[PDB]
Motif scaffolding. Structure first.
Motif, short mmCIF file in Angstrom:
data_model
loop_
_atom_site.label_atom_id
_atom_site.label_comp_id
_atom_site.label_asym_id
_atom_site.label_seq_id
_atom_site.Cartn_x
_atom_site.Cartn_y
_atom_site.Cartn_z
N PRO A 77 0.76 -1.31 0.12
CA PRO A 77 0.07 -0.05 -0.05
C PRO A 77 0.81 1.43 0.12
N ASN A 78 2.08 1.21 0.42
CA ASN A 78 2.90 2.38 0.62
C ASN A 78 4.23 1.95 0.60
N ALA A 79 5.17 2.90 0.47
CA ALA A 79 6.65 2.66 -0.28
C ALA A 79 7.59 2.08 0.96
N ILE A 80 7.25 2.50 2.13
CA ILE A 80 8.02 1.87 3.22
C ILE A 80 7.78 0.37 3.33
N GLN A 81 6.26 -0.03 3.30
CA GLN A 81 5.95 -1.22 3.52
C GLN A 81 6.56 -2.13 2.39
N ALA B 251 9.57 -1.62 0.44
CA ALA B 251 10.97 -1.84 0.74
C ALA B 251 10.98 -2.97 1.50
N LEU B 252 10.24 -3.13 2.79
CA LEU B 252 10.38 -3.80 3.71
C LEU B 252 10.09 -5.45 2.99
N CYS C 284 12.98 -6.92 1.15
CA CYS C 284 13.66 -7.55 1.87
C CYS C 284 13.18 -8.92 2.55
N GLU C 285 11.88 -8.86 2.91
CA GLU C 285 11.47 -9.83 3.80
C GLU C 285 10.76 -11.17 2.59
N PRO D 261 10.70 2.29 -4.70
CA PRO D 261 11.17 1.64 -3.60
C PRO D 261 11.93 0.47 -3.90
N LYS E 130 16.25 -2.66 5.88
CA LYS E 130 15.61 -3.26 6.87
C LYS E 130 15.72 -2.84 8.40
N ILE F 182 14.99 0.89 8.87
CA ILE F 182 13.43 1.02 8.71
C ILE F 182 12.74 0.53 9.84
N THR F 183 13.13 -0.68 10.31
CA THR F 183 12.30 -1.23 11.16
C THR F 183 12.68 -0.64 12.50
N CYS G 47 10.90 2.92 12.88
CA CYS G 47 9.46 2.62 12.53
C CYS G 47 8.67 2.20 13.92
N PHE H 71 14.85 8.74 2.62
CA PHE H 71 13.70 8.12 2.33
C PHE H 71 12.67 8.02 3.31
N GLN I 208 8.95 9.83 3.50
CA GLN I 208 7.88 9.09 3.61
C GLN I 208 6.81 9.12 4.84
N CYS J 235 4.48 3.85 10.33
CA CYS J 235 4.88 3.86 8.85
C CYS J 235 4.03 3.02 7.99
N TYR J 236 3.04 2.10 8.69
CA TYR J 236 2.24 1.45 7.82
C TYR J 236 1.05 2.20 7.26
N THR K 162 0.79 5.51 6.09
CA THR K 162 1.65 6.79 5.82
C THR K 162 0.75 7.15 4.48
N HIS K 163 0.02 6.26 3.86
CA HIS K 163 -0.64 6.72 2.69
C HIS K 163 -1.97 7.30 2.74
#
Ligand SMILES: *[C@@H]1O[C@H](CO)[C@@H](O[C@@H]2O[C@H](CO)[C@@H](O[C@@H]3O[C@H](CO[C@H]4O[C@H](CO)[C@@H](O)[C@H](O)[C@@H]4O)[C@@H](O)[C@H](O[C@H]4O[C@H](CO)[C@@H](O)[C@H](O)[C@@H]4O)[C@@H]3O)[C@H](O)[C@H]2NC(C)=O)[C@H](O)[C@H]1NC(C)=O
Ligand SMILES: CCCN(CCc1ccc(Cl)c(Cl)c1)C[C@H](O)COc1ccc(NS(C)(=O)=O)cc1
Ligand SMILES: *[C@@H]1O[C@H](CO)[C@@H](O)[C@H](O)[C@H]1NC(C)=O
Ligand SMILES: *[C@@H]1O[C@H](CO)[C@@H](O)[C@H](O)[C@H]1NC(C)=O
Ligand SMILES: *[C@@H]1O[C@H](CO)[C@@H](O)[C@H](O)[C@H]1NC(C)=O
Ligand SMILES: [Cl-]
Ligand SMILES: [Cl-]
Ligand SMILES: [Cl-]
Ligand SMILES: [Cl-]
Ligand SMILES: [Cl-]
Ligand SMILES: [Cl-]
Ligand code: NA
Lengths: 355, 356
Positions: free
Chosen positions: A47-51, A53-54, A57-58, A79, B42, B45-46, B49, B77, B81, B284-285, B287-288
């Protein structure tokens, strides 16, 4: 048992995931896969750019993907380019057309099986030779995409010449000052690069200045005859549509073929290392990444669903095919195609502005 | 006075006690030291967040002990965001990022690209080194570097001669020996190099193979190539010159102090004019959706802070305005050695003539 080599994808739907799965399974069938054998790993867009990116990775890099297919959701590829680029894992764009993805500084391991919008200049140029338009006015939006189209056309011209280039501030609604500057010039052929909304503003202002009638030629790209741009577009206008440009299924199939070919070519060389497994605790680049990028860049796939697949120096698709479209009685009508290198006029007559 | 949450994130060996020691407004900081082990996308960011969903974080001060310029890219980034102020005050986090996002609230301790390039020409003029070439990679900034040089040159009644500009593509492997063939085209006695520490490591190894590192050739690089000056790649040639903000007179304790002050002062200054500050994003989940409720309004204050009568202001482009820079020289013992200051738009060099 063979060595199992994962390819990743970020795609629009579960349906397109399954298509990717089946394409990889087909590549395994048709290739010799005693030594190495591909495996599909995919998610859909977050839904968004941070998720997102994660998730790269995941979900993907945790599987040690050698490459990642990415479609434009119909929220960008960016991303995925960033995160994958951190490791020099190549990203293949499937449907993204924006010229910005051709910038190595920002997207440093990115190829795509469609061309950027700016490459539409290649077709304009062949059109200018064909119909002997030796003097053109170029009107572009003063953003990245606009300037990219200008640079690309000016490179091709420098035969036919641009009498002037006019740039305008994106989001401007009254464009009569700019268009008055073009009206005073002698050339009557006008090429436009602009977003949907900005093309609309141009078309309106041009009509009020009576620059859309007999005498004038308007030559634009795909964005400028899409959505609302189309609704106020003048009759006789010529524009472009990338054939298969929106067909995620077609590009998945072609991208997988190219990447599978490239993987097998890669593993004919010595000292291939694996990509990192996961992001956590890994800050070094994939040492073999830059090599694999060179092998992709130079991959040639002649028998593509979307035609002949090669990549230029920026990793952008070459030999793209365009429909040449002409607005007649307010309907978009195909009057030809650019087949990759050659203009082919079909039997339907072009009607110019006025006629 | 109400409290705002500030996370101070420290990567790698650091004296937290000495830090928590260096540390009147309409608002008052609640500081929170978090240690972090890893500096992949990761992990970073993690970590941030999770912080933002446990406490109410108005701003982040970030310091690390790596040479990883990518940390700055990741933070920009994250900042754009989530629209959260982040200061990269030390390490990879402070290694210049050119072209921060439109929405970035990411600010870095240290000089812009353009200011370093300006310093580098000043060094050249001091020793009357007027003939030079440029080598860069595609690392973001490289255009800003070349352009700054070019327009300084072009507008000078001095006999500058820029002989070659090389652009090196290190996104591809070098099994065709391309970079070697490009480098073998250099004649100039001064070579300005813009790239990353890790890239320079490779470029120097190649230049040496081709006889370009020794006497008769002087290489000058920016802060991010020298990076951590206690880590000196073997491929780095003796006699390398660098502009540096690595950590000479401006210690980490002091930096974290000023970082906390910048965020605190900025918020106070905003609460005072508008009777609100922006609410810390709690996810962060999300932000949209929550995006029309957020802006980078705090930026306009972030960049105009005086503290303890020290002008700590940033450029709009997100770098420090008046950093005192240290010009350093990689000596025969392969230690980095002070040989200059750049202070008040003034260069003050140690030597009138270079010893060897
Ligand atoms: C987009 O459209 C273009 C143009 O149509 C295509 O390019 C042409 O591809 C065809 C293949 O179908 C080529 O045709 C072959 O031409 C050969 C000689 O070419 C020379 O002369 C031509 C004309 O003057 C020049 O354009 C060209 O530069 C060369 O100097 C012939 O020798 C070939 O004959 C062979 O096939 C015939 C038919 O079966 C046999 O009878 C013969 O024995 C022989 O085996 C053939 O005619 C043509 O040359 C190409 N033109 C150009 C300009 O490249 C693209 O393929 C098309 N793109 C896509 C993606 O479809
Ligand atoms: C506007 C710049 C954006 N930036 C994105 C980096 C990034 C952002 C967020 C994350 Cl979350 C991650 Cl993970 C990575 C681009 C990235 O900084 C490109 O990195 C390099 C580009 C070129 C070169 N030089 S080259 C092509 O010769 O090898 C080296 C590094
Ligand atoms: C998309 O391409 C596929 C082949 O991969 C084809 O079967 C399908 O007809 C195409 N869709 C459209 C709308 O043309
Ligand atoms: C980071 O390393 C320190 C020192 O060993 C340790 O105490 C801490 O638990 C680690 N943190 C994480 C998240 O692993
Ligand atoms: C920055 O410095 C002071 C305010 O602290 C003032 O002289 C100047 O106007 C400020 N600049 C602004 C508010 O843009
Ligand atoms: Cl098989
Ligand atoms: Cl992971
Ligand atoms: Cl036709
Ligand atoms: Cl950690
Ligand atoms: Cl961003
Ligand atoms: Cl720097
Ligand atoms: Na590319």
């Amino acid at each position: 048992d063979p060595k199992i080599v994962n390819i990743g994808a970020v795609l629009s739907t579960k349906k397109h995931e399954q298509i990717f799965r089946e394409a990889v399974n087909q590549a395994n069938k048709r290739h010799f896969t005693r030594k190495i054998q591909l495996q599909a790993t995919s998610v859909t867009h977050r839904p968004n750019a941070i998720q997102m990116a994660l998730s790269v990775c995941e979900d993907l890099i945790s599987s040690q993907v050698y490459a990642i297919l990415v479609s434009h959701p119909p929220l960008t590829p960016t991303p995925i380019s960033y995160t994958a680029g951190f490791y020099r894992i190549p990203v293949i764009g499937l449907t993204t057309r924006m010229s910005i993805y051709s910038d190595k500084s920002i997207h440093l391991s990115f190829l795509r099986t469609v061309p950027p919008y700016s490459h539409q200049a290649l077709v304009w140029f062949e059109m200018m030779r064909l119909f002997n338009w030796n003097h053109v006015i170029l009107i572009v939006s003063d953003d990245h995409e606009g300037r990219a189209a200008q640079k690309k056309l000016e490179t091709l011209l420098e035969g036919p010449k641009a009498d002037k280039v006019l740039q305008f501030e994106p989001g401007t609604k009254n464009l009569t000052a700019l268009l008055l500057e073009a009206k005073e010039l002698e050339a009557r052929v006008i090429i436009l690069s602009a977003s949907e909304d900005d093309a609309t503003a141009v078309y309106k202002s041009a009509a009020m200045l009576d620059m859309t009638g007999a005498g004038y030629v308007w030559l634009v790209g795909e964005r400028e005859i899409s959505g609302s741009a189309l609704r106020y577009a003048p009759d006789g206008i010529i524009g472009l549509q990338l054939i298969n440009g929106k067909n995620e299924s077609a590009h998945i199939s072609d991208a997988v073929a190219v990447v599978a070919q490239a993987i097998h070519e890669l593993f004919e060389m010595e000292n291939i290392t694996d990509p990192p497994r996961g992001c956590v605790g890994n800050t070094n680049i994939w040492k073999t990444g830059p090599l694999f990028k060179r092998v992709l860049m130079s991959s040639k796939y002649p028998d593509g669903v979307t035609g002949r697949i090669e990549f230029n120096e920026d990793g952008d698709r070459k030999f793209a095919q365009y429909s040449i479209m002409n607005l007649q009685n307010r309907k978009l009508v195909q009057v030809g195609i650019f087949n990759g290198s050659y203009i082919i006029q079909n039997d339907r007559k072009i009607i110019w502005p006025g006629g | 006075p109400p409290s705002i949450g500030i996370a101070v994130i420290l990567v790698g060996t650091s004296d937290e006690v000495a830090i928590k020691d260096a540390h009147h407004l309409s608002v008052v900081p609640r500081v929170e030291l978090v240690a972090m082990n890893e500096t992949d996308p990761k992990s970073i960011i993690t970590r941030i967040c999770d912080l933002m969903s446990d406490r109410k974080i108005q701003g982040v001060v970030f310091a690390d002990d790596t040479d990883q310029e990518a940390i700055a890219q990741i933070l920009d980034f994250i900042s754009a965001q989530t629209l959260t102020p982040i200061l990269g005050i030390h390490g990879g986090s402070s290694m210049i990022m050119a072209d921060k996002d439109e929405s970035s609230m990411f600010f870095q301790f240290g000089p812009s690209i353009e200011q370093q390039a300006s310093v580098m020409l000043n060094i050249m003029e001091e020793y009357d080194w007027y003939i030079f070439s440029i080598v860069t990679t595609y690392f973001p900034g490289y255009q800003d570097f070349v352009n700054k040089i070019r327009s300084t040159i072009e507008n000078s009644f001095v006999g500058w001669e820029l002989e070659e500009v090389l652009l090196l593509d290190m996104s591809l492997d070098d099994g065709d020996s391309k970079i070697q063939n490009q480098l073998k085209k250099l004649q100039s006695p001064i070579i300005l190099l813009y790239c990353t520490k890790e890239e320079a490591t490779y470029i120097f190894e190649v230049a040496n193979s081709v006889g370009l590192t020794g006497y008769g050739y002087t290489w000058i690089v920016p802060s991010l190539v020298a990076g951590d000056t206690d880590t000196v790649p073997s491929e780095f040639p003796t006699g390398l010159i660098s502009v540096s903000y690595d950590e000479w007179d401006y210690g980490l304790p002091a930096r974290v102090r000023d970082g906390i002050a910048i965020i605190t002062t900025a918020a106070s200054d905003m609460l005072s004019e508008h009777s609100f500050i922006p609410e810390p994003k709690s996810s962060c989940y999300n932000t949209h959706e929550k995006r029309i409720y957020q802006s980078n309004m705090l930026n306009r204050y972030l960049i105009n802070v005086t503290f303890e009568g020290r002008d700590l202001s940033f450029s709009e482009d997100g770098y420090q305005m008046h950093p005192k820079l240290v010009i350093i020289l990689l000596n025969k013992e392969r230690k980095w050695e002070r040989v200059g200051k750049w202070k008040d738009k003034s260069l003050q060099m140690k030597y009138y003539v270079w010893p060897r």
